[PDB]
């Protein structure tokens, strides 16, 4: 499938379109889209919550829901905390490719 | 201090002497002696034998080891006064002992030295 890039307008198809397809899921909140209320992630609700070991398993369980809806060509493997600086947690979104 | 008359807050007596500041040291010195002077209604107007001094200074120790047992004092020493006890003092009924002990200080100031580190942040991975 051939789509266009979000910035700079260039049509990119293979796997750069795959990565921006995921980051339109993860950063859109629910109900922000027009006439598509069941689109996006609850990750903005997980913004600025304390990083516990139940916060990690609630992000894995919510990325898997939101990518399971509107990204069928990605099989999610794991989400892991790899570093912590002040506020900035960072997550290695790893997943196999299907489709 | 706390709500509706919940606590009392004073450890220290009105004392210009720094030794007798706390209420506990003033009470312990006044309430280990009636715990001894009762239990020693004897050893007064009895009659001084040869081992009279020894048989009561082993009875002062026995009535002080139970005070260490119930946590009233920390380690003590009870011994007869060697230089004040003399033959001229026996003729007027005067005999002397040394009941030097110590007491538990009340923890009026528990200090907690505390910071927020970032040491166990690698536990969150």
Residues B71, B94: Cα–Cα separation, whole Å? 32
**How many residues are given for chain B?**
125
How much helix, strand and coil, in percent to the nearest 5, is found in chain A? 30, 25, 45
Resolution of the coordinates, Å: 3.5
Dist CA B47 CA B25 (whole Å): 34
Q: How far apart are CA A63 and CA A70, in angstroms?
A: 11
Helix (H) or strand (E) holding A42: none
**Chain B nearest-CA residue for A80:** B125
B116 shares contact with chain A (CB less than 8 Å): no
Chain B residue with Cα closest to A92: B125
DSSP three-state, residue A4: strand
Integer Cα distance of B52 and A58 in angstroms: 82
Task: Please report the sign of the dihedral spanned by the C-alpha atoms of residue B40, residue B42, residue B48, residue B51.
Answer: negative
Check B124 against A81: CB less than 8 A apart.
Answer: yes
Tokens matching residue A46: 């997980």
Contact (Cβ atoms closer than 8 angstroms) between residue B51 and residue B81 = no
Residue A84 touches chain B, beta carbons under 8 Å: yes
CA B24, CA B108: separation in Å to the nearest integer? Answer: 11
Per-residue tokens: B105: 């200080």
Q: Which residues of A touch B121 (CB under 8 A)?
A: 84
- For B59-114, where are the E strands, in sequence order? 73-74, 79-80, 97-98, 102-103
Contact in structure between A40 and A30 (CB atoms under 8 Å):
yes
Assess contact for B40 and B59: CB atoms under 8 A.
yes
Distinct helix (H) and strand (E) counts, chain A: 2, 4
């Amino acid at each position: 499938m051939i789509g266009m890039d979000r910035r700079s307008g260039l049509p990119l198809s293979g796997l750069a379109h795959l990565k921006q397809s995921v980051e339109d899921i993860l950063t859109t909140p629910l109900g922000s889209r027009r006439m598509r209320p069941e689109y996006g992630s609850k990750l903005r609700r997980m913004v600025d919550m304390p990083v516990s070991e139940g916060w990690k398993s609630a992000v894995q369980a919510e990325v898997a829901r939101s990518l399971g809806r509107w990204e069928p060509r990605i099989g999610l493997s794991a989400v892991r905390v790899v570093a912590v600086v002040d506020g900035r947690v960072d997550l290695l979104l790893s997943g196999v490719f299907e489709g | 201090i706390r709500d509706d008359g919940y606590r009392l807050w004073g450890n220290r007596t009105l004392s210009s002497d720094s030794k007798w500041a706390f209420v506990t040291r003033v009470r312990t010195m006044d309430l280990v002696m009636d715990a001894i002077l009762a239990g020693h209604k004897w050893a007064v107007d009895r009659g001084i034998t040869k081992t009279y001094v020894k048989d009561v200074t082993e009875g002062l120790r026995a009535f002080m080891r139970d005070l260490k047992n119930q946590g009233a004092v920390i380690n003590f020493e009870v011994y007869a006064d060697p230089d004040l006890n003399s033959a001229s003092q026996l003729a007027q009924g005067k005999v002397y002992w040394n009941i030097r002990f110590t007491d538990v200080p009340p923890a009026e100031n528990p200090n907690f030295r505390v910071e927020v580190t970032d040491q166990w942040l690698t536990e969150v991975l």
